[PDB]
């Protein structure tokens, strides 16, 4: 968790509303990963659970802050998928909502943080909704998501959406330049690959990721002129395949614009030069569809999905083939 400098505008805007009573019991924060919704929700949680706030800040001394620092505040709740699963069950939710019906142990506010409302199960989201439609006194809910479209529809309409928008690109590049030492086109590229999220753009430079993209890039440099796309399996067959497929989709889409990958105009050119627009699009549609298949229910056998993808792509390159 980190307090990024672009969070202030949003923080002061939301915090003031809770302070002046214009706060919603259900705040749905929309944000890309690495934008700091977690730090924002925490700073707001800390403010509300501060028994003696100093302006918009938590004091860091009162007992409430002491129990928060310790991680033992009885009135603060966290709903995250049990480390054993990848979704959020109904028992966990109800278990927290049931307790939300008792008078707050420290006699003040109660705060509930749903880490990713998308992971909620259909019965869990349905149970949360019931609580949201009849909010227990002095309870403040914070639900965060990357894509609110992936949420139980009825849940979305009971929350006030606050979109945590990325800061200006130029500001983000500079921030990044301070976190790592790289050519600025690579930074801007990482940033565009991340949809403007500076934290996620920084995660790419930390470890496996940046090198993985180069390997992919090197692998594409061979597949394009050779027509051998199945050879890409190594660079894509890995846990983080969904992100790796995004990179790919991103290059194809750049090749179709006669720009996200500003650091590799060479390969974008090679793609736009050797592949017809009809094929760049057919390949792009397929890549995006498999990307989703891998994220919706990572087909128990991911390598099959990908190999078939690479073979459909090679089928596309053939003269006389109908592209659909």
φ/ψ of 113, rounded to 5, equals -115, 110
Q: Which residues bind a second copy (CB under 8 A)?
A: 1-5, 39, 60-61, 63, 65-67, 69-70, 178
Nearest residue (CB) to a second copy, 126 versus 209: 209
- Please name every residue paired with 142 in a beta bridge, in sequence order, or none if there are none: 27, 113
Q: Choose among Zn ion, a second copy, none what residue 69 binds, the Cβ cut-off being 5 to 8 Å by kind.
A: a second copy
d(CA 221, CA 230): 13
Q: Choose among a second copy, Zn ion, none what residue 50 binds, the Cβ cut-off being 5 to 8 Å by kind.
A: Zn ion
Nearest residue (CB) to a second copy, 2 versus 289: 2
- Please name every residue paired with 141 in a beta bridge, in sequence order, or none if there are none: 26, 112
Instruction: Tell me how far, at minimum, the Cβ of 309 lies from a second copy, in Å.
Output: 36
Q: Choose among a second copy, Zn ion, none what residue 1 binds, the Cβ cut-off being 5 to 8 Å by kind.
A: a second copy
Nearest residue (CB) to a second copy, 1 versus 322: 1
Instruction: Tell me how far, at minimum, the Cβ of 11 lies from Zn ion, in Å.
Output: 16
Helix (H) or strand (E) holding 160: strand 160-163
Q: Choose among a second copy, Zn ion, none what residue 3 binds, the Cβ cut-off being 5 to 8 Å by kind.
A: a second copy
**Both structure tokens of 295:** 């994220």
d(CA 3, CA 36): 7
d(CA 281, CA 279): 5
Binding mask 45-74 for Zn ion (x = CB under 5 A): -----x-------xx--x--x---------
Residue list 236-295, contact with Zn ion (CB under 5 A): none
Contact 65, 50 (CB under 8 A): yes
Instruction: Tell me how far, at minimum, the Cβ of 107 lies from a second copy, in Å.
Output: 12
Opening angle at CA 237, ends 232 and 238, nearest 5: 140
Q: Is 111 in the site for Zn ion (CB under 5 A)?
A: no
d(CA 23, CA 162): 12
Instruction: Tell me how far, at minimum, the Cβ of 31 lies from Zn ion, in Å.
Output: 24
What's the CA dihedral at 307, 310, 312, 315 to 10 degrees? -130
d(CA 314, CA 318): 7
Q: Strand pairing of 26-30 and 110-114? A: unpaired
Percent helix, percent strand, percent coil in the chain, to nearest 5:
55, 10, 35
Nearest residue (CB) to a second copy, 5 versus 225: 5
Nearest residue (CB) to Zn ion, 62 versus 288: 62
Residue 48 Cα distances to 20, 75, 133, 196, angstroms: 12, 11, 21, 30
Nearest residue (CB) to a second copy, 49 versus 65: 65
Q: Choose among a second copy, Zn ion, none what residue 225 binds, the Cβ cut-off being 5 to 8 Å by kind.
A: none
Q: Choose among Zn ion, a second copy, none what residue 224 binds, the Cβ cut-off being 5 to 8 Å by kind.
A: none
Nearest residue (CB) to a second copy, 42 versus 229: 42
Instruction: Tell me how far, at minimum, the Cβ of 141 lies from Zn ion, in Å.
Output: 21
Instruction: Tell me how far, at minimum, the Cβ of 79 lies from a second copy, in Å.
Output: 23
What is the full DSSP assignment across 90-145? HHHHHHHHHHTTSPPTTSS-EEEEES-GGGB-HHHHHHHHHHHTSPPTTEEEEEEE
Instruction: Tell me how far, at minimum, the Cβ of 62 lies from Zn ion, in Å.
Output: 3
Q: Choose among Zn ion, a second copy, none what residue 66 binds, the Cβ cut-off being 5 to 8 Å by kind.
A: a second copy
Nearest residue (CB) to Zn ion, 18 versus 230: 18
Binding site for Zn ion (CB under 5 A): 50, 58-59, 62, 65
């Amino acid at each position: 968790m980190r307090w990024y400098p672009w969070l202030r505008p949003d923080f002061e805007k939301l915090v003031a509303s809770y302070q002046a009573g214009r706060g919603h019991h259900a705040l749905l924060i929309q944000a890309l990963p690495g934008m700091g919704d977690d730090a924002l929700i925490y700073a707001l949680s800390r403010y509300l659970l501060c028994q003696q706030p100093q302006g918009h800040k938590s004091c860091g001394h009162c007992r409430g802050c002491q129990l928060m620092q310790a991680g033992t505040h009885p009135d603060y709740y966290t709903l995250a998928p049990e480390k054993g699963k990848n979704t959020l069950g109904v028992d966990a939710v109800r278990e927290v909502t049931e307790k939300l019906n008792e008078h707050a142990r420290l006699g003040g506010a109660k705060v509930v943080w749903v880490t990713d409302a998308a992971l909620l199960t259909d019965a869990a989201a349905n149970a949360l909704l019931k609580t949201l439609e009849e909010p227990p006194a002095e309870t403040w809910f914070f639900l965060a998501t990357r894509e609110p479209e992936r949420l139980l529809a009825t849940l979305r309409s009971r929350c006030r959406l606050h979109y945590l928008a990325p800061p200006p690109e130029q500001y983000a590049v500079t921030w990044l330049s301070r976190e790592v030492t790289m050519s600025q086109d690579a930074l801007l590229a990482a940033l565009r690959l991340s949809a403007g999220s500076p934290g996620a753009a920084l995660a790419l430079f930390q470890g496996d990721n940046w090198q993985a993209r180069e390997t992919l890039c090197q692998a594409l440099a061979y597949s394009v002129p050779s027509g051998d796309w199945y050879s890409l399996l190594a660079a894509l067959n890995h846990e983080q395949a969904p992100a790796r497929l995004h990179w790919l989709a991103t290059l194809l889409m750049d090749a179709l614009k006669r720009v996200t990958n500003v650091d590799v105009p060479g390969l974008v050119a090679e793609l736009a030069n050797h592949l017809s627009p009809s094929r760049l699009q057919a390949i792009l549609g397929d890549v995006c569809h498999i990307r989703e298949q891998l994220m919706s229910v990572t087909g128990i056998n991911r390598e099959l999905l990908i190999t078939d993808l690479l073979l459909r792509i090679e089928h596309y390159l053939q003269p006389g083939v109908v592209l659909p």
